[model samples]
Target: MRLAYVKNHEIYGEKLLGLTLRERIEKTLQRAGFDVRFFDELSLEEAEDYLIILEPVLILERDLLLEGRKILVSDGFTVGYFFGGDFRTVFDGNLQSSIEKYLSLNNLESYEIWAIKLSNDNLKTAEKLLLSSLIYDGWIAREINRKVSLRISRLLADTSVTPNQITVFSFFLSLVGSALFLLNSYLTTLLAGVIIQLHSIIDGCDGEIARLKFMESKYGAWLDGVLDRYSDFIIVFSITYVLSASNPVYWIIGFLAAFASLMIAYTGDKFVAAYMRTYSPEGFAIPITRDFRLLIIFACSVVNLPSLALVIIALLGNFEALRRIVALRSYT
Candidate 1:
């Protein structure tokens, strides 16, 4: 997978004050082994095609999106980083939100990791951390799936249920857990956790069923994709509803996290279509298939650590979606 870097011309070129920041960022990323590039003179379309070919992990300034619509249009699945911006400012703005909405309607997935600059000098450091976190989490998720899939495959072969049926059933079970969160009782919450955990395992079963039966189809695959997002909402909303009285911020975080995660998925899908003529199917396909989120939720439930788990999971979930978008651009 490639990472694309986009910089503001004012910030990237040797315009006195801009020169130090630009050099620092380029030097830092290059030291970290990123394939870095500058776009002071190139048109956005040329930059977009170059990005498609190189697939560099992107480190962009916010204005790039405003000025580089052609770049956005050209590489639907390209993953990039946005630097030196406020989280609320970036996420709450109408333009960015509208862009996200457009991507959703068009089924394109793109990822942005918002790391507000602590100070002007630290912007590059923050960007590096953000990019590294994505790479690390992605590697962990992949390793987890690789280790677990074979065992799941064996178990699924013994069952007679269709993959689509399994998908429907698993989602329904997840919904039940979501519903249980409406009750105020802690015991009920714990019970919901149990159901949620079961839901996760069964989530894996659907893909296993498909693989074992050799019954994979585009229609079924699409349904799985759509329903995966639905499942995320159900779980997050359920938890939010349960904790609304105790921690309202958690509820907001959960909602924003879920929304961002969905949009990122949509962006990657769109990116694939713009350049490759097909969806890049690496990380986007694996999250739903492996059911990693469910596993984390289950562990948290068993240990009575749901709140902490929610925080980590929500952040990781959103970031992973971004990572997938980047990876799709890189590898496609």
Candidate 2:
């Protein structure tokens, strides 16, 4: 398939992410095996029939079909138009209504159009700077994570930071956080809290970089998830060790937290696991995999409330795990 950008320089008006709209479009279309030929100053005839003419201000959520769809001629300005072999021409003057009219017209029923409206500041400030990171995010995504992560992702895009490398760095950073939690000193504990928060933020960067650089992998994602489970367990155990020296109760709480957390993780990975329950409960009634628990830890750690944090993980975190398992069963 040949795709050609037909008009304007500020493609998509700016950029949706770190890359320009054209750059992003090329990446997506090329990956999908479509040839994006430059259509500089070409008329419909000169540009080649069946050429999917892309405008600088429009983005397809997916591919656009030129078949059967006619020109969107509005007030003598062309909004967008498509051509084809089997499709009849239906020209409408209104941009919004034209799409509807064209689709509603005879023999124009097989196409689905997905477009993201281009905003003026898509690249300089808003969507490009923020919402791009949010494309796949869930409830666990906090504002800081949602906002700052994109900037980090953009910066890291030009750097040598690979996703897996970020993962490894995250693991060690979490480890250092665990160690700091061990000492229980005010300054050390405070620093540990900062480190945990940093790790969590950086934690977001690994996948962020992976996506921006097109280095995504199934195993890499799986590996990152598994590593998180380990990291979660290690942090809890370390905290348990530190707090348990004063009282053994911390040991039990920590163990339960780790066990429950691990079990919760396992059930999802394996449709069937040893742990089972009926009606049991339901999803968080909400959330994502790791962000919640880590945020809890980050919160408590910052206030020098490590013990309190551990207790919450033992109790609420377990409840969350149980809730998800029940929800999973419901779905099955």
Candidate 3:
């Protein structure tokens, strides 16, 4: 399929978020596996192929165009058009905005047409769109994660903060929280639990900023995931250890909690991989979240009842893992 990106009225040279509007569209087109050819005026020589006459400045991601659709018009505008099979019989009108001229006829009204528009001046609107696109259609992200994540994305937009940096910062938060466990005092343990809850909140910022800035990557995601694994273990072990000095059951519950937490995440990951699916079970789960677990710890710590928190995690985490196992069995 051939595409002609009209370059006559170039309003897209204007820059936003350091990337020109035209460049963003071109980049996304390339990413969508389209080799859109740039040309000036639509000519009769290439009238045999598909033609896309768009405003010089526009921003849309991969989902703008759907397959098997002959015409993709928005607001009576011809952004995506076809010129195959009896185009001369389609209409007879003035050549200005030729596709728009075609749409003046009501014969093609029943065909699929999209009513989407791309704004040129509003980064805030664009950012929200990008964030919405980043989320999977049916998956449910933790509520607290979503709340602070976009805030983090906007606040860190002007800085040199990279996704990897945010990932490391989350780890550092966990480590600091874990280190506090060594102090072996009620005050320190309470402080540690509070910090661990903060860690859970900050953990979401890395992935959010990654998607926000078009910096999402597999290696970086794996780096973040692996680091989180160790961080979880460290935080749980430390809390288990410090509290266990007073009661042995805290150590047992802590180990069980961490082990079950690992299984819950691990099984979901493996199930998705084995089933050849793009989404993990955790993406569809309710409660039993890392954020929820950490918040529980936070509340328990505030009340000086960290052991009770560990017990809850130790049981809830494993039960959720078992639930996931049964649910995923439906797939296998």
Candidate 4:
């Protein structure tokens, strides 16, 4: 078995970036046709116990290549770095260098980073790269937010604030931001996007705090699920209201779109509970969470394209809800 683990303490300045790198590296490896498994510290310990049973080939360290060499000699396994450096940097240097020098020289098989070599003057390549970078930026931003939320959760673990309170607070923050979308001012709309994203970070923090303190309650979980949907609808509905005030026809369409979005959540939950009662775990039927929708909306808001964002949100959100409903019914 090949396993990868991050070192206990590293000089890595950004925890969120580090975590995202780890995730993306693992993802990249899997995509590159490597038979690999990622393990947390605890899982890594368990794997150590079963070393004799499994007779594993390699253990890849997040840093330093000592373990990789040991595994290669002992188990005939090759290890590769999963996460390091920016995408371009990794694509150009570290990944390529490691593959050629270590794996090729040692006659070992391992995964290589996926890439493309288009003409330097290729506008299509430039466009593709830019688009890919935007996707990565959204992912990295969310990862950063996740890390910050965890840190905040740790600090507030001993405080009186409950997870549900955090959830409610997040909803209100998002609401305030969404309300700003109605204003005609460009700065206001931009500010709203920033505020909504901040609210999203806080939304992520509540669960981390709950998990860290071992205070996860069934009611709290359910409340979080319901409020997440409510917050999404509220934000979109507020935007629709703004749009409608500007144009009556747009307003009508926006309101319907917002309602449909909320109904999507409702229908999804109902479908799951109605058919898959035994398998319907708490919070399992909540449909699309705020994280997914917020990312979509944030992009739209930043570009001053709130209407387009609403349309996308409503269509995709409702489709997800309908998809779950159909899936649950089929399962039953």
Candidate 5:
């Protein structure tokens, strides 16, 4: 379907969350499979098939109908028309009469349309509105972190920092936190736990900033995933090394714990590689996940029992990994 932007005598060039309104609308329409063009580029009479005349400032949800001889309106003003072949705006000056006599004026709420009152005005409101929908709050920690992460992303949006830079920063933050375990003291361990949780919280910011600014890239995603493993390994090894000084058997437990944890990620990656799709977390709970694992580590560190955390992670990670192996084999 062709979506021709009907130029309104208003501003849409102002940037919102790093993208101008025009750019955002263009991306939204293009991603929704619309053949976008300005009305001036192709005159209404010169055009042929089905088309929707859109006000450039209006943002539409993906599911909204863009076809049929329906009138799109907001606040009693004519926004656009969804029509084909011959078209004319009857009673153009009389907004209500034009809508009543010529075509059906749709309620904006019913259509899920977002009309921009003024370009660059209420930007924080706009970002907050969009951020809620953009974020994935599937797990417990993520649910708790969503609001704070959105706030951070909004603050970061004004800066020129790239998403990949945030990813690297988060990794280094985790690196320092992990190294603190080597000091092997109650206060240092407690502080390290706090830093570990801090790392997890900040870890979300990279993706949040990436999405808000449309800076997502394959390389950025790959780097985030790969660096996470390094963070996880160091954290596990350091905790193990600290406890191993008292009982050498903990060296064995630490290796097993780290290997099991790595295998959980390895199993998931292999499934994606084989199927070319992500494995569904159907029956799995948060217990086997990375976020929960880190949370447990933090909790254990707080109580000065990092060894117990290692044993728990070892048992759960290995069980989860083997569970995937058994379940995924059936797909073959």
Candidate 6:
């Protein structure tokens, strides 16, 4: 269906990150399967066919407004309504009273009325807050590394650099971090942990910068994913080799850990290919996510226990892979 954003000239002109608020909303709406158009572009008759958004707001989830909902009101403010030719908000003594009256009369579900308002004064704040929305929900990336990534992303938002460049930069940064592990000293290992953690945080910038500048590409995403797997293997192998230097038999554990790490990503990739959508796996499997694994690696590295991190990754990564298999079996 069509989505028409009724622009508020004042607020709509404000830019966040690198895009004007209007452009940001348009891009987000277009990605959500909407035939995006502006209110000014529609004819009187055509208006009836569109879901018209009246306020400037950022909708993080695509499905929030696409579930055949009649209207959207966020925080007692009328945000949008499916254009049915005519509608009006109640005029009580108060705004909240009007919203409550409308909600009660129509029996509108709370889930349908969700959005984040945008204005000029809070553009920088919104940039920071909305950057967190770039990440998948409930992941360690949001908690541990988002703050730093957001800062770096904003710094590069107006620059000439592309997301693919950041992706390759992070990949080689991981190589540097991994190579440091070969030194096998407490100081070097500690530095490696710090570097890897920085790598994890910097890696987030590729996608963040892409979305901010609307430069996302299929090739860019595939390239980023492929490079991440290589980074994972090399980093794990380096840490494992450090321990194996003392005992030849330890290579077995290193190989298993490295293999399991790749398996975690493999299962996820296969699930997406088979189902044609992302499977939102939860609980114990979440820790095996690459971002969290890197965080774990950094933590263990600080204590000069990089071997402990590999063991943990091997145990949980294998279990997580198997867990996905069982979970996927239930999906069908």
> Among these predicted structures, which one has the highest lDDT?
6
> Which model, 1 or 4, shows the larger TM-score?
4
Encode model 2's per-residue lDDT on 1-332: one tens digit a residue.
44443444654445454556667656655664545655545433232333344454434343344544456432344445555522224433343454467546644323334444355644354345333633334355556665666667777766767789989988999999989988878778888877877777788888877766557788888888788788889888888898888999888888987886676567566643344532333323434245666777788877878888777767776776777656665555
How do these models rank on TM-score, best leading? 6, 3, 5, 2, 4, 1
Task: Name the lDDT value of residue 210 in candidate 3.
Answer: 75
Local accuracy of candidate 6 as per-residue lDDT tens digits, 150-218 = 888988987889999999999999999999999989999999999999999999899988877779999
The clash tally of candidate 6 reads 0
Q: Give the distance in Å from residue 135's predicted Cα in candidate 6 to where it truly belongs.
A: 2.5
Each prediction's RMSD over C-alphas, in Å, is 21.1, 6.6, 4.4, 14.1, 5.0, 5.3
Residue 245 shift from truth in candidate 5, angstroms: 0.8
**lDDT agreement of model 4 with the native:** 0.53
Q: How far off is residue 59 in model 3, in Å?
A: 4.8
The C-alpha TM-scores of every prediction are 0.47, 0.70, 0.78, 0.51, 0.76, 0.80
Top candidate on TM-score is: 6
lDDT (tens digit, per residue) of candidate 5 on 62-144 = 34555445555655655555555444444354433653665554332323254443444666565566665456234745665
lDDT values of the candidates?
A: 0.53, 0.63, 0.66, 0.53, 0.70, 0.76
Candidate 1, run of 10 with poorest lDDT: 45-54
TM-score of 1: 0.47
For model 4, residues 173-285, the per-residue Cα lDDT tens digits are 98789778767566888888888878877876677656443356889878887887787777877787777776777775676557766776576466557665433323334
Worst 10 residues of 3 by lDDT: 132-141
Model 6, residue 48: C-alpha shift (Å): 7.8
- The residue ranges of model 6 lying beyond 4 angstroms of the native Cα positions read 1-5, 33-48, 63-69, 84-113, 136-139, 282-286
Model 4, stretches more than 4 Å misplaced? 1-145, 275-289
Candidate 4: clashing pairs of residues: 244-251
